[PDB]
Nucleic acid binder design. Sequence first.
RNA 1: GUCCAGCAGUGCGUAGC
DNA 2: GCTACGCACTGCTGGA
Length: 470
Amino acid sequence: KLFITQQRMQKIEELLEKVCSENPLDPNKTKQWMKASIKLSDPSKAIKVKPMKYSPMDREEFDKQIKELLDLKVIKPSKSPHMAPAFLVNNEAEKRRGKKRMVVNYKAMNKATVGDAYNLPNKDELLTLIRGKKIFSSFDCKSGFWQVLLDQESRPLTAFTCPQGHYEWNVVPFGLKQAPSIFQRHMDEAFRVFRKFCCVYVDDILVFSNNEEDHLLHVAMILQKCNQHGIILSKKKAQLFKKKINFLGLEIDEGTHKPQGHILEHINKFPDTLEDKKQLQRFLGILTYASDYIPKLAQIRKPLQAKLKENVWRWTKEDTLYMQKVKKNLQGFPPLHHPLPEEKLIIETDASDDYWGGMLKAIKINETNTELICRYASGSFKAAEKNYHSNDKETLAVINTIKKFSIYLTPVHFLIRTNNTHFKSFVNLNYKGDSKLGRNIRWQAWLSHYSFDVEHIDNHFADFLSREFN
RNA sequence: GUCCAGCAGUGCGUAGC
DNA sequence: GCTACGCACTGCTGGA
């Protein structure tokens, strides 16, 4: 018996081994393909930032990390006229990685260099590409920027300082403004030919297929592409043949998507009683990652945002009991539908005195159909917009929802459900009101770029949440 | 402390009424 | 007073 499929898996596993390494400059695995150029734009000047002070724990670790970096031959001793300070950072990735991360403050040199015009992808334009796919693999480059060689005139620009002195970089360092663009350009050049089953966000390669069979071919082609170009992957971070893949901070399924669980876990580390305002802004910061997933989250967040104002610190038993509910639903909100390419899309929108809301729905086809929720949007009205009439806030809710969902809606005939009985006449340029003509023509122009019908207006999760809060 | 991205916000200039 | 577009800056989070 053959087991030709297990043979293909071992072949994939060997291609993976062939392109993985812990050294981004690995002499057996790089062709020195990727090169970059960084230009002052006023070459006459010198960019000198005052150094920093270093504690012993940091002066120690620096010594360890600098020997590593010197050993990889990514940095080297420098007598450059430019200098930028290095420091260590300890954020949630570092805490769990077990190692402090070194950062060079390149703000001054970034102000001072010619930009790279090359744009990064939009996260929604990548996600819409994988709608319908069943199987995924994902690959992070090993310290990717460090695989791009800097030419001789550009390396002095990278010179930094640290306890052990004055070094510069032989490769593109993290923290330069051009680096994501330089790397994205290279990944697009290596892999654009496989755009039908592969996309890259800077650093991260995603392979997607609608079944295991295709995937064996798809992954092998990407891995043989890395080998051809000397692109070094990180074995520890390879996600091979997964039904659920982590990508762009999301957990994505054939039919569903949610934030990565390890992100919204940190909500449950906050107390029900916040000590100070600085901790409240830490809390609001992470609560941000639920906006696509909680209906009317702008409102839920407003009571808390108030406390942040300098004008206002007084925590109450209600403040405490508010935290508890908020914490309970900001973890364990249900995953949302990732719509198939051919599924018909609907947006339902609503408005209140101070906020707008909208919700994206898809029509799952069943031989009686079904409407699945894909994404939520919410926000509060600008200063001038609170004086809008109640029909125009409802129209604004339509516009803001489309804007948020525009990557999905733009190429498709979709359906808007609103409570503005005059919205239908308005978009058909049949609207009577001449009072605010310029704003109306502006909206009519903007809405003209979309193709849609209109209906007048089953979200029990949102009904639960509203009940449980007031 | 950089950089990308998420969320909220502040200021400013230019152009039109 | 309004609109627009686009520059500068701030706080927090995620991560490289």
